[PDB]
């Protein structure tokens, strides 16, 4: 069975989707990885758009929302975008999902992944920065959550809120933390000193490169802790 | 009765909240204006946070979500932040709203504003870039919508989607358009040539200042057209 990681944040602008791309890409080097763009903003899909255009994929018809609606089969949406890196793209129609009236709505992605799953070692799911039914679908499939967060007003309260949300879903779902946009010269490192003592704190990403090496480090620590 | 303007976009990163602040601030110069932050990300509230801290307001207890939940009275949340500019702040707890089970949920803001309204000439409501029940609450109170949008993949499709959403609410709600981050040197001005022929197209904002003057222009055209 694949290990399923949701990349989440209920704050926008914390490099959620960047983290998802990079961690997934790193995992793809020695594992088979599916990346699922479940973000209405579709940043991961935009990042790979060039490659998707070259293959002439109709992601208007073949996308995560059309899977959730059971209008297409999951396998027909899967796009190879890098070596050992497959992608299910998002499209703006995902915006309707929260309003669609559907039975057993929370379990639609869990159902769909079950028909597939076994081809993959990891599934990394990128979600909207909202507590909504799209997120619940991700969380109910997942084994782990990684939250990239930034030193900001209300960061710990936001984290508490997200945690509350997970419990009220009735999940026992471990959440691992990264501080992104990390400012080594910051005067009051108030988030770092709160988070650093937590067992699931992975590390910081500074505000071929030294960027990727910081992610490799985070990833190494995560894979060690799980 | 106040004229109620929802500032919306289902794409993030188009200066939705910046537009809301600036248009509202301009309207406040010769009118009494209430700004409502109904965005889970709370950018307008962050913008005014300094002023809110100086007044020692507990926006943990007194905020738009607590109004929607009927735990506090609207008037007890209102914060004066500039001359003729009042503010109802947002807080991260707004994230739970989409999941709260509540009767006549779509009309909660409309109900709350009715107990107040009459003190104001304009109410400007900033919303999340999501099609959800928070947005519906805004739209059902509104007389007009202004959408600041950017030259991007899927812009016209996103606009179509938003329009579909408004009709399915059963509203006859005019939508006015701005292109923000406008690049006068752009090679293919494909959005501008589509939008420029529409009667509700207000104009462009370029990527005391010349910035405010472009907004004044947009605002003048809007007030002329309505
Ligand atoms: Na939605
Ligand atoms: Na929500």
Distance CA A35, CA A70 (A): 19
Whether A112 contacts A65, CB under 8 Å: no
Measured CA to CA in angstroms, residue A121 lies from A45, A200, B116 at distances of 21, 22, 57
| List of long-range contacts for B13-18, beta carbons under 8 Å, 24+ apart | B13/B150, B14/B129, B14/B148, B14/B149, B14/B150, B14/B180, B14/B181, B15/B148, B15/B180, B15/B181, B15/B205, B16/B126, B16/B127, B16/B129, B16/B148, B17/B41, B17/B43, B17/B44, B17/B47, B17/B126
Q: How many CB pairs under 8 A join A and B?
A: 62
Distance CA B108, CA B68 (A): 6
Measured CA to CA in angstroms, residue A174 lies from A37, A98, A110, A177, A219 at distances of 21, 25, 18, 10, 15
Q: Do B92 and A154 touch (CB under 8 A)?
A: yes
Helix axes A210-225, A16-27, angle to 10 degrees: 70
Q: Which of A26, A60, A11 is nearest to B40 (CA)?
A: A11
Measured CA to CA in angstroms, residue A200 lies from A12, A144, A169, A203 at distances of 22, 11, 20, 9
**How is B129-167 classified by DSSP, letter by letter?**
SS-SHHHHHHHTT-SEEEEEEES-TTHHHHHHHHHHHHH
Q: Report domain extents, chain B.
A: 1-226
Whether B93 contacts B127, CB under 8 Å: no
| List of long-range contacts for A198-204, beta carbons under 8 Å, 24+ apart | A199/A225, A200/A174, A200/A175, A200/A176, A200/A225, A201/A176, A201/A177, A202/A146, A202/A176, A202/A177, A202/A178, A203/A178, A203/A179, A204/A178, A204/A179, A204/A180
Distance CA B21, CA B49 (A): 13
CATH of domain A1-226: 3.40.50.300
Q: Do A98 and B130 touch (CB under 8 A)?
A: yes
Q: Which of B150, B130, B139 is nearest to B36 (CA)?
A: B139
Structure tokens at B128: 């999340």
Edge-first strand listing for the sheet containing B201-206? B79-82, B85-88, B33-38, B122-127, B3-7, B144-150, B175-182, B201-206
Q: Which residues in B100-110 are b (16+ Cβ under 10 Å) and which e? A: eeeeeeeebbb
Q: How many CA atoms lie less than 13 Å away from A93 in the CB half-sphere?
A: 15
Helix axes B210-225, B16-27, angle to 10 degrees: 70
In this structure, the strands spanning A79-82 and A85-88 are antiparallel
Radius of gyration of chain A (CA): 17
Distance CA A213, CA A210 (A): 5
Q: Does B49 touch chain A (CB under 8 A)?
A: yes
Backbone angles phi, psi at A202, to 5 degrees: -90, -40
Backbone angles phi, psi at A154, to 5 degrees: 75, 15
Distance between terminal CA atoms of chain B? 15
Backbone angles phi, psi at B212, to 5 degrees: -70, -35
Place of tokens 């039914």: A133
Distance CA A141, CA A6 (A): 9
Backbone angles phi, psi at A184, to 5 degrees: -60, -30
Residue A186 DSSP label = -
Q: H/E element holding B190?
A: helix B190-195
Nearest CA-CA distance, residue A203 and chain B, Å:
25
Structure tokens at B47: 């913008």
The breaks in chain B (C to N more than 2.5 Å) occur after 207
Q: Which of A67, A109, A40, A11 is nearest to B10 (CA)?
A: A40
Structure tokens at B17: 């909240």
Residue B61 DSSP label = T
Place of tokens 């932040």: B81
Determination technique for this entry: X-ray
Q: Which residues in A74-87 are b (16+ Cβ under 10 Å) and which e? A: beebbbebbebbbb
Q: DSSP E strands: which ranges in chain B?
A: 3-7, 33-38, 79-82, 85-88, 122-127, 144-150, 175-182, 201-206
Tabulate helix, strand, coil % of chain A (nearest 5): 40, 20, 40
Place of tokens 């973000």: A39
Whether B88 contacts B102, CB under 8 Å: no
**How is A97-115 classified by DSSP, letter by letter?**
TTT---TTGGGHHHHHHHT
Distance CA A37, CA A175 (A): 19
Q: Does B117 touch chain A (CB under 8 A)?
A: no
Distance CA A82, CA B182 (A): 34
Q: Does A93 touch chain B (CB under 8 A)?
A: yes
Whether A157 contacts A67, CB under 8 Å: no
Distance CA B47, CA B21 (A): 9
Q: Do A128 and B130 touch (CB under 8 A)?
A: yes
Structure tokens at B169: 């609410």
Resolution of the coordinates in A? Answer: 2.2
Q: Which of A66, A131, A201, A83 is nearest to B128 (CA)?
A: A131
Q: Do A12 and B12 touch (CB under 8 A)?
A: yes
Q: Do A98 and B11 touch (CB under 8 A)?
A: no
Place of tokens 């003057």: B213
> How many angstroms separate the alpha carbon of residue A32 from the centre of ligand 2?
32
């Amino acid at each position: 069975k694949p290990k399923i990681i949701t990349i989440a944040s209920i704050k926008g602008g914390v490099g959620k989707s960047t983290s998802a791309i990079i961690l997934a890409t790193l995992l793809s080097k020695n594992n088979k990885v599916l990346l699922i763009d479940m973000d209405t903003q579709a940043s991961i899909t935009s990042y790979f758009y060039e490659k998707i255009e070259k293959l002439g994929i109709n992601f208007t018809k073949f996308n995560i929302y059309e899977i959730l609606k059971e209008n297409v089969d999951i396998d027909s949406t899967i796009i190879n975008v890098d070596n050992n890196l497959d992608l299910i793209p998002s499209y703006l129609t995902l915006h309707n999902f929260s309003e669609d009236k559907i039975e057993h709505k929370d379990f639609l992605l869990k159902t769909s992944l079950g028909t597939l799953y076994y081809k993959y070692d990891y599934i990394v799911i990128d979600t909207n920065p909202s507590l909504d039914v799209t997120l619940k679908n991700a969380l109910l499939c997942s084994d782990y959550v990684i939250i990239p967060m930034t030193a900001e007003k209300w960061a710990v309260e936001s984290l508490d809120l997200f945690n509350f949300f997970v419990r009220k879903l009735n999940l026992f779902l471990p959440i691992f933390l990264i501080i992104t946009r990390f400012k080594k010269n910051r005067t009051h490192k108030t988030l770092f000193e709160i988070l650093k003592t937590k067992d699931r704190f992975l590390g910081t990403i500074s505000e071929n490169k030294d960027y990727i090496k910081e992610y490799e480090n985070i990833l190494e620590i995560f894979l060690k802790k799980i």
